[PDB]
Design a protein around this nucleic acid. Sequence first.
RNA 1: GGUGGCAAUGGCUAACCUUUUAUCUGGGCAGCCGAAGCGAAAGCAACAUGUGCGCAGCCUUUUGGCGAGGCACGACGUAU
RNA 2: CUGGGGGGCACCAACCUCCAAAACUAAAUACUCCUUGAGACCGAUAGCGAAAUAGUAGGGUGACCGAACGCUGAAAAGUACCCCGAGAAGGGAGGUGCAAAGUGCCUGAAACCUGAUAGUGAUGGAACGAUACGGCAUGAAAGGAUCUCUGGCAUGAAGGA
RNA 3: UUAUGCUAUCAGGUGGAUGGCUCGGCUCAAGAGCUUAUGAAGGACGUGCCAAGCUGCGAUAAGCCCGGGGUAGGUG
Lengths: 140, 252, 126, 119
Amino acid sequence: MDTKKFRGSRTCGGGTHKNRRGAGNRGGRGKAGGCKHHFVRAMMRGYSYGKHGFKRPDEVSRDVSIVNVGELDELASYLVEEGLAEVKDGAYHINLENLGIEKVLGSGRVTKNLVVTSEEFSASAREKIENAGGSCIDAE
Amino acid sequence: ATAKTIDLTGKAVGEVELPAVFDADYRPDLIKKAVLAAQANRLQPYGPRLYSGMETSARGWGSGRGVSHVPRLVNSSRAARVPHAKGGRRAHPPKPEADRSEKVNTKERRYAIRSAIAATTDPTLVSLRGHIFEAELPIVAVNDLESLERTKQVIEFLEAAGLYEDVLRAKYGRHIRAGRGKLRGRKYKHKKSVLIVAGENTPILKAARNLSGVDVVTVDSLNAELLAPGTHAGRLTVWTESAIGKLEGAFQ
Amino acid sequence: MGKKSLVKLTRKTNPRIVSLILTLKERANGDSAPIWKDIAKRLEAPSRNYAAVNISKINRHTAEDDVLLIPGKVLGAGLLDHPVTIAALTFSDSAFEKITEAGGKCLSLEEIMEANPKGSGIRIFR
Amino acid sequence: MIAMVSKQPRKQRKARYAAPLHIRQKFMGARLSEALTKEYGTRSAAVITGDTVKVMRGDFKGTEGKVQSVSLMDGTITVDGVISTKVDGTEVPRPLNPSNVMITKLEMKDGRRASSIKK
RNA sequence: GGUGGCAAUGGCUAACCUUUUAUCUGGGCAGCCGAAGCGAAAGCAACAUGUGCGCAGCCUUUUGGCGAGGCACGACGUAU
RNA sequence: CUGGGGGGCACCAACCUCCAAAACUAAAUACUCCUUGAGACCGAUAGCGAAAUAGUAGGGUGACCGAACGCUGAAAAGUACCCCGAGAAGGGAGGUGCAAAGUGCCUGAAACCUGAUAGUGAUGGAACGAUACGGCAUGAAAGGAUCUCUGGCAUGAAGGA
RNA sequence: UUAUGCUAUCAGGUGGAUGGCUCGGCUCAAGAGCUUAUGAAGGACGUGCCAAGCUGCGAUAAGCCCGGGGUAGGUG
Ligand SMILES: [Mg+2]
Ligand SMILES: [Mg+2]
């Protein structure tokens, strides 16, 4: 706190000089007082007691990266500019495994012709891709 | 943009186009931040000894003895170990593990450096900042300035370029400091005259070295202290053609 | 401009903002147009809560050949279809490239206040 | 010989105070007259008993005389003519400092003196 | 919180190297946060604006109109 | 060896991967008695307990606890000679020095003690003072000169005999 | 000449604050890093012309011999 603000105040913003003794003016040390006298604060902070669910090992689980069709469509010109994509006979041939994306979602609009190869496709993503005349290949 | 180039005789022998670093707006707060960060990073840890004032086995006498409740020596009545007792420890002293280094992002640090470099173009900032000069800012010199090897030649050039009165001002402004700093190594208070910039290491960094106030550096050694001593831009400086070449995209 | 606005002015550090605020109030008195006084009171707000406008929002709301005052920074995210004039406080480089490719202009607040004395048709965005 | 890494006053005064007694011979240095310097090539020299000095600073500016004694530990020399009187009246030598004198006549009796002055 | 740099084509580097003595200049994309959520988990995967009220500001017959941000809806992803 | 181990509960199968129960091995790293350098460090009740005749004086049967003390002057030129005194005490006079700074001697605050000056004082009631009016003392510098004192004239708000 | 006293200022005593100075302390960095039965570190006692303490030294006792550097004084 601002020490110079309190030169000549005695109590230094604490009230009586009987406050600020030690751990008993805080109710215990740490998150102490779980549900006897700090129960309401315990519930509001996000420290409620309980155990709920299980965990799978991290060896087997994976966290897929995603990209929506709108995002993939809008930045296609920049992708071919960087040499990532390819523009043979007009339709963009864009491969998602060189970027680092394992699944294509479907939020947004698609207007350009896209030939997208990847591992996974939501149903709506495939519907939107092929309603614009494009094609999707399950990359293996 | 364009600026007159003057030889060692003081005659304009060309007109060189400046790079885009010199064309930027003045920003005092960024320069402030950069200079303060570097000066904070120079510092050096200090503090008392590990167990100072506490190597003791004092015990209190308790109540009933007619005296206070402070710890005292085992074979006497002299208080010890507490901050208000003579010879006792100090409450909240400095600590050697305190880390006082500051951080500045590279983009804003480069931006402050560019802002400080562009400030030397303005005659007003240079003039009101303390210096004395009779030249057309900015001062640009032909590349043979890196060939000078005797201090007398550098003095001749400075006299012919109207920048020697600042050197004399720095020489005669050297004066003894006041306070406890004299006993610790900082005996004088110096003044800042002129900064000479060269593209590459040459004998000029050894000739214009003893002149009072003059600091000579290469283009790859510019920071914010050199250009804003005390967080005030407007430092007299000299450049060369090679130095101008080095600054096409130097800090962008 | 009581002591309140003087305090809010004293907090600022960047000189260009201070010069803008003073000149905007002067110009607002000169032309009797509340637009400049409004922009001054906006620029004098907390710096945490300025405006950051993406290209998509301008494309969504404006039409062909509008004039725009953005007391903040224009960010480049989206696609710009039609020419627009966006006089804002600052642009990012991608935003500048997109607006230039579309065929618009990127002129600062000084240029817009100098060119148009009254703001007869300016649209404030946020 | 103590390089620029000795810019602290504490170190310099330690070096001058607790010096080996063969280094305190160097502190007995005094300027040479013009002829001496242009015939030996050393801008200065050391003061030794038996040579004529010319006082340059203090109460006796311009008085000449021989050096009557030298003390290494004190760092002071004694000169002819320069004296102080007791209360009862007794002329006493007054110590000086060799950096306030000028050598006009060297005393060559060692033989090693010439080599000692230079190189 | 006050003030700043950069800005979805995002922001910052850490250890370390260049140190020419601790500064400093230039590298360093490992990694962290943001960018998609729901669910114990397997798994599945959304509006890049469809409607209304309307402050500032602008236009105007000084009464109305347009109306960023704001508020209220509608529609959709997932769990039960 | 047509062998053996492992692949986060046990066993079976496929696949992947290794060869224990013997041994050595530089560099990158840790530390500070010690040597050198540097300091937005402390500056004598501070900084190490110790600016070291300091782990000392001193205290405890013992394990062990543990202080205080820096500084004449540029140069001793460290007070000659005379009087008092029992005096190698000390005082006076007289000298040295720009200046007594006269030996633990730079500057030399307050508490406390001695004397002098101003006010008051042996009929007198107390938180030791604030405000207004008087006596006595002082009022050189740094404070005033349409300023201080005494009156006349013109305008005079609320109020108003 | 009002004594014993009270208040304020001045001169002196006592005392050792403040200021100025400081061969000391502390922290960080760079180096360097084992020694002893061929008797170590540490201790007791002795050793000086006048010498009690500390420091050095060991009945050859603030010390002896040789090589180099240094040059006119030395005796912590
Ligand atoms: Mg201490
Ligand atoms: Mg002490």
